[PDB]
Amino acid sequence: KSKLSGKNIGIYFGTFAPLHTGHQQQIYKCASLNDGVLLVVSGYDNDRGAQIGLPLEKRFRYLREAFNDEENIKVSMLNENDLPEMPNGWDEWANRLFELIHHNTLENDLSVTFYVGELEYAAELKKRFPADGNQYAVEIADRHDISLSATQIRENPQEHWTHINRVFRRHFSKVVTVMGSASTGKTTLVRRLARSINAPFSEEYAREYEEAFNIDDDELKMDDYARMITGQYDANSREVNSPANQGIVFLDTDAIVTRVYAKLYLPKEDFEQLEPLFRKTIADERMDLILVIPPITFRHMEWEESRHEFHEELMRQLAEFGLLDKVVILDDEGYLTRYHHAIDAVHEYTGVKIERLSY
Numbered sequence: 001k002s003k004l005s006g007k008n009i010g011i012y013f014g015t016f017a018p019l020h021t022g023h024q025q026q027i028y029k030c031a032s033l034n035d036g037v038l039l040v041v042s043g044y045d046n047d048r049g050a051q052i053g054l055p056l057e058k059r060f061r062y063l064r065e066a067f068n069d070e071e072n073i074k075v076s077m078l079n080e081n082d083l084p085e086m087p088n089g090w091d092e093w094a095n096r097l098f099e100l101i102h103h104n105t106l107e108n109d110l111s112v113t114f115y116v117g118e119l120e121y122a123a124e125l126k127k128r129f130p131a132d133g134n135q136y137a138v139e140i141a142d143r144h145d146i147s148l149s150a151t152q153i154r155e156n157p158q159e160h161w162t163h164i165n166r167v168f169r170r171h172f173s174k175v176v177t178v179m180g181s182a183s184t185g186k187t188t189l190v191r192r193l194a195r196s197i198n199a200p201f202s203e204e205y206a207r208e209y210e211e212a213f214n215i216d217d218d219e220l221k222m223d224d225y226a227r228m229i230t231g232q233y234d235a236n237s238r239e240v241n242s243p244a245n246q247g248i249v250f251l252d253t254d255a256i257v258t259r260v261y262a263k264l265y266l267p268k269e270d271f272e273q274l275e276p277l278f279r280k281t282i283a284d285e286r287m288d289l290i291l292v293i294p295p296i297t298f299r300h301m302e303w304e305e306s307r308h309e310f311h312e313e314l315m316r317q318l319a320e321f322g323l324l325d326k327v328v329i330l331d332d333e334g335y336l337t338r339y340h341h342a343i344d345a346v347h348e349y350t351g352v353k354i355e356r357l358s359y
């Protein structure tokens with residue numbers, strides 16, 4: 001009984017890559033004028049949304065979540081694959097459309113209104129109203145501002161962040177990850193970089209884990225490393241998904257960093273046993289900028305020594321995963337300080353404005 005109730009039904013179309021407040025204002029007006037609204041997400045393989053990593057199936061799921069607390073609003077999918085390109089696609093297209101209306105509606109003798117943004121769709125739809133006992137009307141709505149907003153969001157999400165629907169925000173987020181040995185100032189750097197622009201940041205999970213479970217670096221076993229992989233990943237996703245996210249988040253280490261420690265300190269067998277979880281987790285990471293603190297002259301007591309060992313292995317692995325074009329090495333102390341170098345790198349890779357201190 002997950003069908004739309006009522007007699008006056010509005011049909012609202014979009015690709016929704018992403019959904020934004022322009023859509024939402026129109027939808028809620030439409031829902032105030034009708035007994036219920038059917039949102040139609042249209043798409044096809046390798047369409048505009050698919051090309052930026054938002055294929056039809058994902059936009060449909062995101063919309064369902066976005067409208068998960070609405071009485072009279074249903075979300076449905078119009079799959080446009082395998083259509084004859086010319087005229088005979090219009091018949092089949094409409095068939096699928098009216099099938100969607102039939103399946104997702106409770107009652108009969110409806111009064112249905114299509115909200116349509118292109119003159120071609122209106123004319124083709126008006127010729128193909130079926131004799132199903134419903135009354136149909138097509139209403140032209142101006143979509144120019146909505147389409148332009150969508151285009152501007154895709155070009156520069158950080159400039160239009162507050163208008164992006166929250167379910168879509170993770171996809172468009174910029175992500176800066178800091179990497180380095182223990183006791184090199186990562187945590188101080190992360191917090192200063194993030195606080196400089198009101199961005200959220202994560203903490204190094206390994207430090208929390210060793211305090212909560214009260215164990216030293218040299219007591220870590222294979223299973224601790226596994227828990228640090230998922231623990232750091234969850235902490236990082238939490239910040240990317242945080243409502244405090246304004247478009248840029250800072251991460252204090254990641255699975256690659258943990259993979260460097262594992263490679264250096266675990267027995268070969270135990271490392272090889274963690275490799276699938278490493279690969280899975282590293283594959284789920286999205287990084288735009290990787291800041292590496294190189295070795296120059298609560299404490300991780302064993303992780304302190306052999307900094308150059310850690311750094312060489314880290315650089316090997318960043319090459320192994322093809323990340324070198326996102327890596328900036330903070331070899332200062334040219335810029336005044338490590339912090340000057342990093343905040344400038346943040347500027348170049350995210351677009352955010354940074355104030356000067358001096359003339």
Ligand SMILES: NC(=O)c1ccc[n+]([C@@H]2O[C@H](CO)[C@@H](O)[C@H]2O)c1
Binds near residue numbers: 170240241251285286
């Ligand atoms: N670097 C990260 O840990 C990171 C960055 C962006 C997103 N995520 C998570 O992965 C998923 C997307 O693949 C999202 O659900 C994020 O939580 C993790």
